[PDB]
């Protein structure tokens with residue numbers, strides 16, 4: 001109804017802090033409305049607070065109510081917030097009372113630092129992530145001038161702007177305003193920094209090649225990253241080297257003390273093998289990160305124990321993967337972080353990996369980078385062969401295209417392809433072109449939207465006309481309704497392309513919801529939101545090649561309310577797998593599985609001292625792969641469940657909460673206790689299963 005927003009002023013609260021709960025209400029009923037707005041706050045099954053205010057609104061008028069609440073004294077507790085305004089409608093949010101974000105991290109990012117961004121605008125984008133998703137830490141991505149010289153100075157003076165490695169202008173005042181805004185919501189700012197990277201031409205900085213790591217035993221070929229312009233490179237160094245540690249840890253401290261960061265997000269490039277030090281000693285790089293990290297933590301904590309937060313990216317996460325055991329078991333990190341590539345493609349394989357990190361780390365929190373739909377040209381597609389084209393024609397003579405063909409020889413001034421699209425709602429749209437190019441170099445075309453020039457786009461060379469890509473994209477704001485998107489070959493464009501299609505790059509809500517459910521039911525969170533409410537499509541965080549539509553935004557608001565409100569049941573140290581015992585889940589009238597099998601309801605059994613926890617994740621109508629696009633699950637109603645429990649257990653009450661249902665509010669279910677040949681059991685009916693239900697059963 002007319003409850004438009006419910007939220008709090010900060011993302012996280014210390015015990016005893018005042019919480020301002022805001023309620024944005026609008027009357028759109030027809031005539032005047034009078035009544036009460038009732039607040040109820042729950043901790044898991046138990047109500048802990050109520051209050052009410054009268055609310056009278058003429059038709060069409062709006063107001064924001066404020067309810068004040070003192071964060072209760074027990075540290076590390078999540079709460080669900082219900083606002084009930086009768087026939088005007090209802091709303092919800094969640095509250096996290098934690099003195100330390102690293103126990104329950106909800107990790108977002110900032111990757112854009114434009115000088116034109118005002119203090120107000122910096123505050124707005126941070127507030128929005130804080131308010132909508134309770135984001136409590138932000139990874140500041142590519143804020144630094146050089147990987148080995150993070151704050152650019154002229155003599156003793158900090159430069160007001162600098163150009164990053166991709167020639168983006170970074171504004172100091174904008175960065176500082178964002179950090180301030182993060183702190184204002186009780187958030188923490190984590191500075192991206194590599195564990196072992198310099199930029200090119202590092203000698204004049206006092207960095208020695210003798211600290212480096214090499215691909216050969218004669219120190220002639222230093223490990224590097226080559227960005228493809230003959231100018232911009234990273235060079236790699238030995239994390240165990242005392243001089244490299246001295247140098248880069250000094251950079252970390254400079255970043256903390258000068259820029260006001262609260263910690264370092266330590267990064268790497270992932271597996272590199274057959275590594276040597278300068279002197280030609282063969283070295284296993286995978287075990288060299290933990291001594292570096294232990295020492296980084298030491299110097300950080302000595303400098304400022306309130307700004308000493310530390311994590312490290314375990315790149316290419318999978319069970320027993322590269323550096324997985326050494327870092328997770330041995331590194332002095334506050335929480336664990338891992339970027340998943342292609343070694344944990346199934347839901348169950350990824351679950352197993354999260355569980356290994358949790359076990360190895362002593363139940364430290366686990367955050368995953370896991371770019372949704374990364375490989376997919378996901379979204380509404382307009383085939384180029386069905387568009388309106390001038391001076392080019394269609395063809396079918398290169399395999400790989402989608403639809404009935406493609407537009408070919410898009411190669412001369414006057415050539416045009418015009419797409420008639422529809423924006424179903426006002427917002428940003430990612431314009432993604434699928435194309436071919438085997439001209440021997442880059443090709444270009446000019447992008448126009450509704451008759452206006454927007455950008456020259458680059459279309460990269462492939463060694464075959466049979467090789468298609470969809471990495472030519474540009475994001476634009478569109479009003480709701482019809483629009484025209486044109487590519488034109490004009491005076492100044494070069495080469496040629498074959499054009500397959502235009503796609504409105506869009507994150508698939510179904511896969512994104514199921515992945516987030518699987519991750520948090522398994523005991524991890526997911527770095528996926530940042531900047532001005534952008535979802536993360538790619539490892540280069542400024543990438544805007546897909547966008548979220550409002551439906552997914554709303555589901556993420558519900559999801560983040562859920563993993564905040566129920567953080568105790570999802571992420572606590574005592575929340576452990578319950579596959580170790582005599583117990584079983586039985587669902588009537590659906591195929592079920594304990595290993596995330598395709599086209600089943602997937603059950604996951606957890607426990608604490610006080611609760612027997614069963615997650616139901618609905619894979620009916622979908623495959624067992626976490627990353628790819630999915631269909632809407634086959635939603636279920638009145639699903640009978642029978643759960644076997646230990647002879648030791650008696651259940652007081654059965655509860656079910658779902659982000660999909662009433663905003664995550666817990667419903668108590670009637671249940672029957674019984675014992676048969678199979679064992680002691682409990683049974684009940686699940687009223688609804690859409691994507692994800694968490695059943696939690698209180699022990700007597």
Ligand SMILES: O[C@@H]1[C@@H](O)[C@H]2OC[C@H]3O[C@H](OC[C@H]4O[C@H](OC[C@H]5O[C@H](OC[C@H]6O[C@H](OC[C@H]7O[C@H](OC[C@H]8O[C@H](OC[C@H]9O[C@H](OC[C@@H](O2)[C@H]1O)[C@H](O)[C@@H](O)[C@@H]9O)[C@H](O)[C@@H](O)[C@@H]8O)[C@H](O)[C@@H](O)[C@@H]7O)[C@H](O)[C@@H](O)[C@@H]6O)[C@H](O)[C@@H](O)[C@@H]5O)[C@H](O)[C@@H](O)[C@@H]4O)[C@H](O)[C@@H](O)[C@@H]3O
Pocket residue numbers: 142194224225226227228267268269270271272313315316339341369539540541
């Ligand atoms: O400031 C930022 C910089 O610090 C830097 O950050 C990069 C990201 O760092 C993290 O992600 C790490 C990494 O994860 C995955 O790789 C893990 C993978 O590594 C091995 O496989 C290597 C490689 O094999 C194949 O290519 C062969 C190719 O490999 C080397 O070149 C690698 C690429 O180097 C250049 O591009 C670098 C970088 O540029 C952009 O990112 C900018 C940021 O860089 C910057 O903001 C791109 O967006 C990004 O995609 C790209 O990595 C070249 O321009 C590019 O062409 C190369 O591919 C080698 O040097 C070269 O000689 C070889 O020819 C394979 O095709 C390729 O996909 C794979 O990466 C190891 O064997 C595997 O086991 C292991 O799984 C990703 O694949 C990789 O892209 C990521 O960089 C952070 O988490 C990210 O947020 C950072 O963006």
Ligand SMILES: O[C@@H]1[C@@H](O)[C@H]2OC[C@H]3O[C@H](OC[C@H]4O[C@H](OC[C@H]5O[C@H](OC[C@H]6O[C@H](OC[C@H]7O[C@H](OC[C@H]8O[C@H](OC[C@H]9O[C@H](OC[C@@H](O2)[C@H]1O)[C@H](O)[C@@H](O)[C@@H]9O)[C@H](O)[C@@H](O)[C@@H]8O)[C@H](O)[C@@H](O)[C@@H]7O)[C@H](O)[C@@H](O)[C@@H]6O)[C@H](O)[C@@H](O)[C@@H]5O)[C@H](O)[C@@H](O)[C@@H]4O)[C@H](O)[C@@H](O)[C@@H]3O
Pocket residue numbers: 398408409410411438439440441465495496497498
């Ligand atoms: O089945 C066959 C098709 O696959 C296709 O094969 C093309 C060639 O493939 C191999 O060589 C790969 C090689 O190509 C280029 O160098 C060779 C090139 O050199 C001269 O042209 C120099 C010219 O190069 C660049 O422009 C190229 C091209 O761009 C526009 O067209 C794009 C379309 O190209 C193809 O169709 C047009 C094609 O049609 C006939 O060839 C049929 C074969 O094509 C077919 O059997 C013509 O004889 C040929 O001249 C013409 O290109 C694709 O099929 C279509 O999908 C693409 O849209 C442009 O309109 C056109 O005029 C250009 O020729 C560069 O941009 C430009 O500046 C430069 O001047 C020589 O005159 C050409 O005849 C020759 O092809 C790349 O430069 C190089 O990097 C690649 O590795 C075979 O070995 C060749 O035998 C094939 O011709």
Ligand SMILES: [Ca+2]
Pocket residue numbers: 383384385401402403404405406499500501
């Ligand atoms: Ca096509």
Ligand code: NA
Pocket residue numbers: 511622623624625626627628629630
């Ligand atoms: Na899938």
